[PDB]
């Protein structure tokens, strides 16, 4: 029989397998440290992998999870959960409740208490299947009192060919106990990458030899007549970056030669007190955080409290993360002193999981995968569900949206459906009330409202045209069980007002290319709204000469669609959110420059925005009971200050069509933090043009993150199938 690589490409429309393989088995083959740039550049030197890419599913980049290391990425693929949820946050970590440390070279690696979640072999055992695992992280640990059917304790002295032959011999096991799920792991090209760097000759040799191993496996598969039955997933966990010895940062220069702290070095450095667990909580982290706050111009690191990191990282829920963290620029690392660190002139990984050099590999082959296709970028945390659809299993709950990755399968198993609203929207009717005085003195150039009833009473055609113009994709729905909201309609912006918290939840509007922005002043001018009862928070007196709080407008009054002045109805009482003094700079700069720039460049944008409340830094919206206690008190009144602000922008893919009639959608979402000061960006003698844009750049997110953190559901009226909508919502903006 000739080598499998020499055969012409074919198609597998129906699997033919011996008895016992009604559902074809799945193989999970991993190459440590193999980054996507390797296949981008040296593909001509790798025949087998290139052929596998040509005759199967392929993606240019697969995004790992933060931190970008071995166990987090190798255990999130099988569990499907974020590192903050399945426990293993890094190769080195400390648990104070256990008062223990986790390490690769110690005996604590096999302690079952370190592992949480639920792997895939556990599910297979529960639902009547057998699995043979060969050197997968976490497989040789008694998780939930269950072992895989066949497993091997890790040992790095075993040659690769013995592993491959053992897998084949398991494949020739009789059907009585034949496994249905296999894995296989190799240590290269990671070791050569560390020793010699991403760009060298030893890495080329390692790539060619692992390709030879893959070809050996494929030839063994073909010799057994299983080359058209098995499902193959060629995967990788991270990438590699070249570290220099002149690109380190030492904390002894700033923090002195102190000897009561410990630092976890690398591109994901962290700080911990030395006295544990007694001083784990009583320690003063904020002092050190403010100590190193941009002590030098353009320093290539940034301190961060673990609850102030960007929400796209998901690195704050667990208690094994130290309350302080350092965000490092590309190619840079951090340490305390030159003694407490590893070598400097070698390759490294572990940086932010959005850098171009940290992306992984994903290739699919077999009857269940499409042929000669190329998909977009997706996270590894969604492979789990895919595997569950390749073995006919019901997945355990995880952090992947089922059906999002459904276009990679010939015959989809699961059909996603849109979530339904819990309760119908209440209505806020007009009620006669006395004309109270709010004590506000503003510019007389603003035209006051004469009759509230007259202008806000509209014929059904008016509401129809306003709904068409302002909500092209339909109103967002609410999934919270106990939350009473009413829909407020205006001339060019639509709002959802919540009676429970006394604040708008979402405001939606559209900005056209020809729309103009005014520049007049509109301060300390508030117009009362009769549709809701008055509140002492809704007066200018509360915000008059206050150094703690302030107010902002969700719908920008600078935008008028009919006149060159300012919009009067945007100054209503029901369009006010509490805001800090410093955040107003970012808000005003955005609404004044960036909105206009986006509208001009993209030919109109549909904008919907609001506040989000999350005091648990867990990624999910707080309940009413939890939200009740967290409200602050000031001036003998009770307020509830937002934690972050979300804004999302929608337009057409092609610039020749207005957002009202988009054939395809292009979306951009941001979740910005609400901080008292701007010490995060370290503005000092710097023009305002750049830092606000950079802050908006760093804090991007996906629509799924916004849905999780708000409890809202978007785009429920589009004619596209639910799978396409789920795929679009999971897309994370790239620049």
């Amino acid at each position, epitope marked *: 029989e000739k080598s499998w690589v020499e055969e012409p490409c074919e198609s597998i429309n129906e699997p033919q397998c011996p008895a016992g393989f009604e559902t074809p088995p799945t193989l999970l083959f991993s190459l440590d440290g193999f980054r996507a740039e390797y296949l981008h550049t040296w593909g001509g030197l790798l025949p087998v992998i290139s052929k596998l890419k040509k005759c199967g599913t392929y993606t240019k980049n697969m995004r790992p999870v933060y931190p970008t290391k071995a166990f987090p990425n190798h255990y999130s693929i099988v569990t499907g959960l974020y590192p903050e949820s399945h426990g293993i946050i890094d190769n080195k970590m400390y648990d104070p409740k256990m008062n223990a440390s986790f390490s690769l070279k110690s005996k604590e690696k096999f302690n079952p208490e370190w592992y949480k979640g639920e792997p895939i072999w556990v599910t297979a055992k529960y639902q009547g299947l057998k699995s043979g695992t060969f050197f997968w992280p976490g497989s040789d640990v008694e998780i939930n009192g269950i072992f895989p059917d066949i497993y091997k304790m890790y040992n*790095g002295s075993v040659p690769f060919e013995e592993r491959i032959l053992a897998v084949l011999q398991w494949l020739q096991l009789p059907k009585d106990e034949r496994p249905h799920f296999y894995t296989l792991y190799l240590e*290269e090209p990671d070791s050569s990458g*560390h*020793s010699y760097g991403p760009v060298s000759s030893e890495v080329i040799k390692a790539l060619q030899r692992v390709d030879g191993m893959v070809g050996m496996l494929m030839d063994g598969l073909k010799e057994l007549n299983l080359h058209r039955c098995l499902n193959l997933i060629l995967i990788s966990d991270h990438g590699m970056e070249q570290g220099s010895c002149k690109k380190y940062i030492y904390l002894n220069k700033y923090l002195g030669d102190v000897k009561n702290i410990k630092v976890i070095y690398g591109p994901a450095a962290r700080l911990r007190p030395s006295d544990v667990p007694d001083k784990y909580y009583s320690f003063n982290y904020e002092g050190i955080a403010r100590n190193l706050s941009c002590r030098e111009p353009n320093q290539h690191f940034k301190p961060y409290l673990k609850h102030f990191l960007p929400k796209r990282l998901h690195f704050a829920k667990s208690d094994r993360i130290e309350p302080l963290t350092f965000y490092l620029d590309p190619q840079w690392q951090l340490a305390l002193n030159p003694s407490e660190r590893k070598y400097c002139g070698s390759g490294f990984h572990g940086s932010d999981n959005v850098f171009s050099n940290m992306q992984a590999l994903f290739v699919g082959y077999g009857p269940g995968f499409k042929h000669g296709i190329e998909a977009d970028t997706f996270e590894n945390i969604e492979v789990y569900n895919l595997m569950c659809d390749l073995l006919n299993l019901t997945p355990a709950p995880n952090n992947g949206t089922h059906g999002s990755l459904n276009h990679l399968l010939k015959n989809p198993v699961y059909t996603p459906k849109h979530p339904k609203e819990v309760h119908p929207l209440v209505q806020c009717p007009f009620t006669r009330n006395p004309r109270d005085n709010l004590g506000c003195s503003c510019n007389p150039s603003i035209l006051p409202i004469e009759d509230f009833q007259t202008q806000f009473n509209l014929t059904v055609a008016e509401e129809k045209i306003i709904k068409h113009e302002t909500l092209p994709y339909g109103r967002p729905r609410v999934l919270q069980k106990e939350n009473t909201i009413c829909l407020l309609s205006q001339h060019q912006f639509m709002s959802g007002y919540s009676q429970d918290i006394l604040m708008p939840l979402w405001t939606s509007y559209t900005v056209d290319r020809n729309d103009s922005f005014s520049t007049e002043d509109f301060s300390n001018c508030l117009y009362q709204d009769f549709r809701i009862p008055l509140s002492p928070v809704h007066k200018c007196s509360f915000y008059k000469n206050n150094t703690k709080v302030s107010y902002g407008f969700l719908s920008p009054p600078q935008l008028n669609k009919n006149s060159s002045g300012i919009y009067s109805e945007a100054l209503l009482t029901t369009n006010i959110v509490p805001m800090y003094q410093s955040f107003q700079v970012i808000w005003r700069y955005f609404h004044d420059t960036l909105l206009r720039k986006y509208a001009e460049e993209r030919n109109g944008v549909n904008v919907v925005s609001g506040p989000v409340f999350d005091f648990d830094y867990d990624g999910r919206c707080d309940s009413l009971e939890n939200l009740r206690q967290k409200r602050r008190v000031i001036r003998n009144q009770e307020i509830l200050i937002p934690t972050h602000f979300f804004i999302v922008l929608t337009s057409c893919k092609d610039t020749s069509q207005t957002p009202l009639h988009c054939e395809n959608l292009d979306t951009l979402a941001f979740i910005l933090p609400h901080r008292t000061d701007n010490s995060e960006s370290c503005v000092h003698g710097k023009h305002d043009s750049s830092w606000v844009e950079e802050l908006l750049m760093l804090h991007r997110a996906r629509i799924t993150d916004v849905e999780h953190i708000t409890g809202l559901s978007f785009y429920q009226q589009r004619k596209e199938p639910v799978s396409d909508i789920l795929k679009l919502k999971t897309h994370l903006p790239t620049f």
Partner: nanobody
Amino acid sequence: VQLVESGGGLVQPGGSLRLSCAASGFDIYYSYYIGWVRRAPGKGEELVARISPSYGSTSYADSVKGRFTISADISKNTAYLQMNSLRVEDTAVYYCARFAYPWYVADDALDYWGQGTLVTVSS
């Protein structure tokens, strides 16, 4: 890639030496083993000590058991071999050796050799 040895010389019996081996071009942490090999006239290659830089486990010859001490500094990529209470036959030339991984069978047992330092003991 190269390995350099330092600390050699001539000492009276009962003295103490601390040979140092510095490697460049690769990483000590990501190496299978780091060892010392001594050669004396009338004798062939002999393994006296070897260490695993990551695990820290050490392997010693019977002739030097209880007399030598091997260690590794990772932040500086160095291997240290301290020898005390030297004997008359301990005079020899020493090499710093790096072993290869057993991942591929068609590979040599060792990969690289150092320049080697000559040590003599006399009254």
